[PDB]
Design an enzyme around this catalytic site. Structure first.
Site, mmCIF file in Angstrom:
data_model
loop_
_atom_site.group_PDB
_atom_site.id
_atom_site.type_symbol
_atom_site.label_atom_id
_atom_site.label_comp_id
_atom_site.label_asym_id
_atom_site.label_seq_id
_atom_site.Cartn_x
_atom_site.Cartn_y
_atom_site.Cartn_z
ATOM 1 N N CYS A 173 4.215 1.059 9.557
ATOM 2 C CA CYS A 173 3.968 -0.024 8.610
ATOM 3 C C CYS A 173 5.272 -0.466 7.966
ATOM 4 O O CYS A 173 6.143 0.355 7.659
ATOM 5 C CB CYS A 173 2.976 0.423 7.524
ATOM 6 S SG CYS A 173 1.285 0.734 8.134
ATOM 7 N N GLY A 217 3.426 5.686 10.333
ATOM 8 C CA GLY A 217 4.799 5.549 9.905
ATOM 9 C C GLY A 217 5.453 4.234 10.260
ATOM 10 O O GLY A 217 6.593 4.001 9.845
ATOM 11 N N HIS A 273 0.806 -1.210 0.000
ATOM 12 C CA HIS A 273 0.000 0.000 0.000
ATOM 13 C C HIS A 273 0.841 1.262 0.000
ATOM 14 O O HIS A 273 0.278 2.362 -0.025
ATOM 15 C CB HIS A 273 -0.990 0.006 1.168
ATOM 16 C CG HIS A 273 -0.363 0.197 2.511
ATOM 17 N ND1 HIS A 273 -0.168 -0.847 3.393
ATOM 18 C CD2 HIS A 273 0.082 1.312 3.140
ATOM 19 C CE1 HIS A 273 0.381 -0.386 4.504
ATOM 20 N NE2 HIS A 273 0.552 0.919 4.372
HETATM 21 C C1 LIG Z 1 -11.526 4.210 8.066
HETATM 22 O O1 LIG Z 1 -10.559 3.202 8.134
HETATM 23 C C2 LIG Z 1 -10.189 2.786 9.423
HETATM 24 C C3 LIG Z 1 -11.101 2.847 10.470
HETATM 25 C C4 LIG Z 1 -10.731 2.423 11.747
HETATM 26 C C5 LIG Z 1 -9.451 1.929 11.979
HETATM 27 C C6 LIG Z 1 -8.519 1.860 10.922
HETATM 28 N N1 LIG Z 1 -7.244 1.434 10.886
HETATM 29 C C7 LIG Z 1 -6.772 1.567 9.664
HETATM 30 C C8 LIG Z 1 -5.363 1.191 9.234
HETATM 31 O O2 LIG Z 1 -4.659 0.584 9.975
HETATM 32 N N2 LIG Z 1 -4.891 1.570 7.919
HETATM 33 C C9 LIG Z 1 -3.554 1.187 7.536
HETATM 34 C C10 LIG Z 1 -3.352 1.453 6.047
HETATM 35 C C11 LIG Z 1 -4.118 0.405 5.251
HETATM 36 C C12 LIG Z 1 -3.930 0.563 3.742
HETATM 37 C C13 LIG Z 1 -3.754 -0.997 5.716
HETATM 38 C C14 LIG Z 1 -2.553 2.008 8.320
HETATM 39 O O3 LIG Z 1 -2.783 3.139 8.584
HETATM 40 N N3 LIG Z 1 -1.307 1.384 8.719
HETATM 41 C C15 LIG Z 1 -0.359 2.206 9.446
HETATM 42 C C16 LIG Z 1 -0.060 1.667 10.856
HETATM 43 C C17 LIG Z 1 -1.182 2.048 11.826
HETATM 44 C C18 LIG Z 1 -1.263 3.667 11.977
HETATM 45 C C19 LIG Z 1 -1.543 3.900 13.285
HETATM 46 N N4 LIG Z 1 -1.086 2.611 14.069
HETATM 47 C C20 LIG Z 1 -0.906 1.576 13.100
HETATM 48 O O4 LIG Z 1 -0.559 0.475 13.349
HETATM 49 C C21 LIG Z 1 0.881 2.414 8.569
HETATM 50 O O5 LIG Z 1 1.937 2.620 9.052
HETATM 51 C C22 LIG Z 1 0.665 2.651 7.084
HETATM 52 O O6 LIG Z 1 0.053 3.915 7.076
HETATM 53 P P1 LIG Z 1 0.932 5.326 7.170
HETATM 54 O O7 LIG Z 1 1.077 5.930 5.788
HETATM 55 O O8 LIG Z 1 2.320 5.097 7.734
HETATM 56 O O9 LIG Z 1 0.207 6.299 8.065
HETATM 57 C C23 LIG Z 1 -7.763 2.101 8.832
HETATM 58 C C24 LIG Z 1 -8.884 2.291 9.658
#
Ligand SMILES: COc1cccc2[nH]c(C(=O)N[C@@H](CC(C)C)C(=O)N[C@@H](C[C@@H]3CCNC3=O)C(=O)COP(=O)(O)O)cc12
Ligand SMILES: COc1cccc2[nH]c(C(=O)N[C@@H](CC(C)C)C(=O)N[C@@H](C[C@@H]3CCNC3=O)C(=O)COP(=O)(O)O)cc12
Lengths: 299, 296
Positions: free
Chosen positions: B140, B138, B39
């Site tokens: 991921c 950040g 992603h």
């Molecule tokens: C409306 O939807 C939602 C509703 C309720 C809860 C939800 N949760 C997520 C989610 O987890 N979304 C992934 C991205 C998708 C594509 C898998 C994400 O945010 N992953 C983070 C790590 C996360 C950031 C905070 N703590 C972590 O563990 C990355 O690191 C990559 O994203 P970044 O570009 O670094 O911010 C979407 C969501």
């Protein structure tokens, strides 16, 4: 919110094995000096009362075998600083990080890199207890393992491991070789003074719990600093200073809960217990997170 | 007993950052391949990853070790991970394997931000395939691993925080643990259960340390124990769980099915204020390997 250690890679590159006679333990190799507990020069007949300067004068450079991996480093010198032996070697450690030697305060935390035979085994977070022990995980052969903090590529070494008390807690020195606490590097059963709970850290951890969406322990009430301290001393908690209140400033700023408001919450938890509820998964009030630990992790 | 992570240095040497447009995450540089979550190519409610990756070329990907750029000479997708071939073999590559772990297994997580390690801690994979982590934006692409005889077994790459605050991710072949998908949507995990094999390991740990009031004179079949365990929200035991209890069973001389009968009594009768290794709560995030690690 989890008990998080520092990445240990910069320390792993410094761990070596030091052997003298039958005794083997871990050493810290920085530039061209290896630091290790001085009781490695010791045999059985002296372990109840070792006259270390007298034992050290009788050793030669070649009595010391230092191994870095398979490679042997040649000792070209030796000296003693309190309970730490300093072995000068003829090879600089190219993996030496930027580093400092520091003596931490009770209540401060650090990462332990547990090592056996010069080989790193595990890493975990510890606090210097108010009675100058640490509640660690160390087995036979862990002597010389080190504790440290990291900031901006500088490793601050604060602990070298020496002994396990009968109660299972642990004791050691800073890197100048001075023990934390009333302990001595002699083969005897030693007791620590009565431990207390690190109050500023319990408060930091309550703030961390609110930052992570847990509020069940908060209440409507407030207390004065001195009234909270009276109750805390009654429960064998360390006193809370205005400096501690200042240090909790940012965390109260983030959550909008005044420090003495959170002190009221803690007083209720102490007088009423947790009633089987948990905070951040624990059924016990956790005191091995500093304010800095919380800030650095939550943000 | 402590939650103790493996030393992180062999994995630290493999962390890089991968940027697509303005999105930066962590990647894992092994030999001449960098692995990261796919992603990174997204701008997200339901991406068409096959169609998104068609619009991407080698030169859209910025891979940096610190501030040094590694040139991308190939790219492909395998499930939810991106594989970027780079022109330099990582000289710090350790001996390594990719493994898919089972619920109950523990591993160390090296939490990273912008390719830079921040901290290390131990996680247990829950029966509902979430972990209880500490991850911010950040993070991921941070990985989880075990180290055995200097071989690093990578088992987890981080993708997602669930609405309840636990975390979900893939193995290094990009297959999610659990029923989750890499979309920007609120996903719920199944109801969790207690990791039985790990509670048993913890009872063995107690016995090794002289704490054995809970042992009894009865035994059980595996099937009888499992049917009762499910009624208390405990995971059923597999043959593989009985196998990894073997070393602890041999060391204490207590049969695994004998220890199951002891736990069965604890579940139907409770603790009665009595403690086990200091606590009235039974611990379920120490594996049998974790126990022999910290006892021997
Ligand atoms: C409306 O939807 C939602 C509703 C309720 C809860 C939800 N949760 C997520 C989610 O987890 N979304 C992934 C991205 C998708 C594509 C898998 C994400 O945010 N992953 C983070 C790590 C996360 C950031 C905070 N703590 C972590 O563990 C990355 O690191 C990559 O994203 P970044 O570009 O670094 O911010 C979407 C969501
Ligand atoms: C009668 O005496 C006692 C009675 C009751 C309790 C006692 N406790 C100790 C003690 O702890 N003694 C230090 C050595 C003295 C000279 C300071 C020691 O044993 N340190 C270990 C690490 C320890 C070992 C197990 N877990 C650890 O943390 C090393 O690693 C070096 O020892 P070795 O090289 O393995 O021989 C002596 C003692």
């Amino acid at each position: 919110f989890r008990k998080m250690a520092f990445p240990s890679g910069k320390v792993e590159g410094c761990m070596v094995q030091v052997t003298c006679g039958t005794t083997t333990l871990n050493g810290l190799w920085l530039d061209d000096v290896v630091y290790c507990p001085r009781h490695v020069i010791c045999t059985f007949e002296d372990m109840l009362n070792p006259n270390y300067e007298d034992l050290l004068i009788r050793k030669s450079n070649h009595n010391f075998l230092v191994q870095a991996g398979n490679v042997q480093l040649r000792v070209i010198g030796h000296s003693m600083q309190n309970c730490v032996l300093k072995l000068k070697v003829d090879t600089a450690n190219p993996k030496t990080p930027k580093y400092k030697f520091v003596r931490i305060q009770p209540g401060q935390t650090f990462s332990v890199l547990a090592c056996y035979n010069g080989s790193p085994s595990g890493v975990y977070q510890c606090a210097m207890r108010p009675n100058f022990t640490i509640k660690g995980s160390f087995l036979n052969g862990s002597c010389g393992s080190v504790g440290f903090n990291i900031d901006y590529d500088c490793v601050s070494f604060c602990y070298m491991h020496h002994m396990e008390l009968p109660t299972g807690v642990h004791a050691g020195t800073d890197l100048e070789g001075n023990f934390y606490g009333p302990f001595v590097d002699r083969q005897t059963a030693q007791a620590a003074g009565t431990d207390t709970t690190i109050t500023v850290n319990v408060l930091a951890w309550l703030y961390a719990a609110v930052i992570n969406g847990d509020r069940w322990f908060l209440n409507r009430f407030t207390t004065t600093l001195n009234d909270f301290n009276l109750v805390a001393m009654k429960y064998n908690y360390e006193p809370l200073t205005q400096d501690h209140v200042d240090i909790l400033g940012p965390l109260s700023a983030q959550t909008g809960i005044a420090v003495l408001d959170m002190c009221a919450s803690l007083k209720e938890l102490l007088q009423n217990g947790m009633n089987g509820r948990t905070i951040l998964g624990s059924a016990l009030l956790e005191d091995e997170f500093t304010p800095f630990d919380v800030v650095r992790q939550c943000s």
